From Swiss-Prot, chain A:
It is found in: Nucleus. The 2 chromodomains are involved in the binding to the histone H3 methyllysine at position 4 (H3K4me3). Belongs to the SNF2/RAD54 helicase family. Present with 1620 molecules/cell in log phase SD medium. This is Chromo domain-containing protein 1. It comes from Saccharomyces cerevisiae (strain ATCC 204508 / S288c). Component of the 1.8 MDa SAGA complex, which consists of at least of TRA1, CHD1, SPT7, TAF5, ADA3, SGF73, SPT20/ADA5, SPT8, TAF12, TAF6, HFI1/ADA1, UBP8, GCN5, ADA2, SPT3, SGF29, TAF10, TAF9, SGF11 and SUS1. TAF5, TAF6, TAF9, TAF19, TAF12 and ADA1 seem to be present in 2 copies. SAGA is built of 5 distinct domains with specialized functions. Domain I (containing TRA1) probably represents the activator interaction surface. Residues 20-31 have a biased composition (Acidic residues). ATP-dependent chromatin-remodeling factor which functions as substrate recognition component of the transcription regulatory histone acetylation (HAT) complexes SAGA and SLIK. It recognizes H3K4me. SAGA is involved in RNA polymerase II-dependent transcriptional regulation of approximately 10% of yeast genes. At the promoters, SAGA is required for recruitment of the basal transcription machinery. The chain holds residues 122 to 152 of 1468 of the full protein. Disruption phenotype: Decreased sensitivity to the cytotoxic effects of 6-azauracil. Residues 5-18 have a biased composition (Polar residues).
UniProtKB/Swiss-Prot annotation, chain D:
The modification N6-acetyllysine is found at residues 18, 41, 77, 84. Keywords: Acetylation, ADP-ribosylation, Chromosome, Citrullination, DNA-binding, Hydroxylation, Lipoprotein, Methylation, Nucleosome core, Nucleus, Palmitate, Phosphoprotein, Ubl conjugation. Belongs to the histone H3 family. It is found in: Nucleus; Chromosome. The modification N6,N6-dimethyllysine is found at residue 41. The modification N6,N6,N6-trimethyllysine is found at residues 18, 41. The modification Phosphothreonine is found at residues 42, 69. The modification N6-crotonyllysine is found at residue 18. This is Histone H3.2. GO terms for cellular component: nucleoplasm; nucleosome. Acetylation is generally linked to gene activation. Acetylation at Lys-84 (H3K122ac) by EP300/p300 plays a central role in chromatin structure: localizes at the surface of the histone octamer and stimulates transcription, possibly by promoting nucleosome instability. H3R2me2a is present at the 3' of genes regardless of their transcription state and is enriched on inactive promoters, while it is absent on active promoters. Disulfide bonds: none annotated.
UniProtKB/Swiss-Prot annotation, chain E:
The nucleosome is a histone octamer containing two molecules each of H2A, H2B, H3 and H4 assembled in one H3-H4 heterotetramer and two H2A-H2B heterodimers. The octamer wraps approximately 147 bp of DNA. The modification N6-glutaryllysine is found at residues 17, 45, 63, 65, 77. This is Histone H4. Its main location: nucleus. CDD domains: HFD_H4. The modification N6-methylated lysine is found at residue 6. There is a cross-link at residue 17 (Glycyl lysine isopeptide (Lys-Gly) (interchain with G-Cter in UFM1)).
Amino acid sequence: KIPTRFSNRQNKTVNYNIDYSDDDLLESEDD
Amino acid sequence: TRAKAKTRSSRAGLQFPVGRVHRLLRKGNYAERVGAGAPVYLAAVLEYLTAEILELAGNAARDNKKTRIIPRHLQLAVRNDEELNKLLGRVTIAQGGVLPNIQSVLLPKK
Amino acid sequence: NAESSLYESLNSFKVANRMLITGTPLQNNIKELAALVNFLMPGRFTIDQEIDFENQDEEQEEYIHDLHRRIQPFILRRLKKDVEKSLPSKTERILRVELSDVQTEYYKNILTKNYSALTAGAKGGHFSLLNIMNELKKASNHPYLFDNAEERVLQKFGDGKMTRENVLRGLIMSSGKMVLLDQLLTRLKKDGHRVLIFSQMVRMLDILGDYLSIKGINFQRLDGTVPSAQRRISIDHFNSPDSNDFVFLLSTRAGGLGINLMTADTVVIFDSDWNPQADLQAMARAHRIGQKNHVMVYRLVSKDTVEEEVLERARKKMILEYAIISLGVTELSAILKFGAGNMFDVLNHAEEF
Amino acid sequence: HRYRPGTVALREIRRYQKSTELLIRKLPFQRLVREIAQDFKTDLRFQSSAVMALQEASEAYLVALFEDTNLCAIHAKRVTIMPKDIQLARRIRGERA
Amino acid sequence: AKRHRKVLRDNIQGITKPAIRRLARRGGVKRISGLIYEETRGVLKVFLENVIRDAVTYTEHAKRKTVTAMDVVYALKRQGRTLYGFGG
Amino acid sequence: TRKESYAIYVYKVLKQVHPDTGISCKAMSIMNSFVNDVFERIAGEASRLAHYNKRSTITSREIQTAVRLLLPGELAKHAVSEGTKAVTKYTSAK
DNA sequence: GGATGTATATATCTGACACGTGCCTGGAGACTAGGGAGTAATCCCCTTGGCGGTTAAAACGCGGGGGACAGCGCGTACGTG
DNA sequence: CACGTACGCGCTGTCCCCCGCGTTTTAACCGCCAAGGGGATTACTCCCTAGTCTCCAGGCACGTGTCAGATATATACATCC
């Protein structure tokens, strides 16, 4: 449920989402 | 009056095995004498490093909508943290891939 | 095979009634029949004990009779001689021939490993002695199967001129099997017969194909590298009534049972298989229903080589199939003593276990 | 409808940096490993995990080499990598030194 | 003429052109010159022969003919290219 | 054959930091290799520290200096803290 | 009168958990020797703040010209289907 | 393998900034106190603690039975044409 262990290191929050979308690259694609 | 065989890891408040680290230090051909607090200290250090990487890998699995840590999550957790990146910069992780990074020269025009 | 993925693919199906169609229920060992009857009857049959030929025990014969009487209503077999009483007889002949000196020196170089002598004049020196039995079979078949082996024969005894005449002589005299094969080809050429030659390795098929190409004999070939369209072309060209083809080469384990060889008469097994059912379907390509000629099989065996225990295991499997399978259609101690013992106008095309 | 030259390469860059599969086929790599191994001695057997570990080592080494090569090509005011970029990277690393 | 050798020698060309292109796409390379592939094949051959020579030395210390994965791990470890996922 | 690994200890550490997150076998082998590699590095550095100071024993000071040398920056000082507190608890107890 | 969407009940997958068992490896207790802590002496090296004198290296200024960089053409080599 | 077009490369201008040289400063370097602490050895003493040994017991690994949540059907009520 709730984590019993945490990190005291003040490292920055990193977005780990490696999912990508090619919607911005549609200028040379079919759009 | 051998009271219930209290383990060293539970005495030290650790989860990593203190006595097994002591046995590996004694049989590892490092020195012919090993102090009492050295396996406690080393087990605590190994536990802390394992906990830090496992926490970042769990965060990386959470951001990828996964409930099971794969080597890709470990690679992302190691490479996105700069202190772990210069701890394991000479280390290959199998089935880990690379960080998604594109140089800004190669980006198109707008 | 019980551990093959098709077994778990088919055994998990929700099926009330199953049925298996085959021609060879026993191929190598009783575990194949055990897997088949476990696919048929799950848990009812409990065949676990193997058959030891070098035991001669009465309880083993009782086990054999129990395996007979247990599967009497579950197995239906009809032989090709019990029905359609017009089939010509099929005779097989085992020919054992002396090795050449090149074959003997390659055999003693492989068996008593001689890497310095095995490389010798080879520039690369990449001789692999993994799978010792496979290298012994290659040495028993032909010395030219090995790399950098033809030029040592050509430069030292054939004088190395390579002027279209000494190469055929080198292929004839390099192996001890191709002198008898050449005599058989000349005898079947001067008579009215067509011959198929079955081989286990397609490199030996290449050797025979190059030999027949430089001989001047219209030959055809079929192996796994040939696609199905060219296989159909080769079969329709060989089975044509106006065919100029004389000899047809086969890889043994290719094409299944759907290959048509009505025009063939003689079958030459160059390489014996570990599974005798593969050889049975090999000379059964010409010995089907409707053959107009007496089918004759010549088996080419190297003397005092690795192929003798290959024939020993093949005859042990044939004795096993004649014991369990052939006696349970629709003297056991005698056939057990026959299977327990070791075995070890000559090319005439004319003529219980 | 034809595409501009470069957006397909960017799509493959964004695609292959996400997935972690091996980009070299198994059988040519096994044949290459056996050919390279057989000159040191003959008759070498190979575990499957050994060839797999060699494969991921080659993957990581060559991907890191192409990152250094791309940085050399960008530093030379180019977007096309050349063998001079490869030999420049290996030297600064010390492989050609 | 059906004559050919059993041992194949062009397996360095078995690392094909689209495989090297996929490797450079993972490396973030947009454009590839035509002379890249032979240099990449030579570099791969040099790296592979270094690692395989060390692994064969590790194997024949153990008096074995089979190259295990742990020998490859040790051979990569000695050169400073340590690999995870096979040590245990 | 009882094959030694660090499986259950890394698993309980994972359940401490993430109680609802699982792990795969390849990731577990990677974590085991990481723990073995870090243990080997710290033990070798501590053995060298004992050898340079003409000391035949390895105590908590050698492991502490090995952590301060090998682990870079702030990761060292928190790891040094975490170990140092544990030795204090174990002394209170044994 | 036939055909279609939603709602509760039962069989099956699936990872996790309770129990069993071996066994072997870690822990408890006792003993001992030696490694390391502590002390004293001796002597050489380092620290911080000064001085004097030499002198070669560092700093500064200025002309100029060689090289970095931007722009343009082109043709070919690489991307794309 | 065919097409097509983008980019690597060659050429030219231009301006700017680095290099060469002369002159002036300045601090590095070498040689000096002035005392005092740090540290490397040599020798000695003492005592705590880790190795060693014996014995035992529970933690870990394996195997297996079950169990609660997730998934897939079985049948009944409401509803469109």
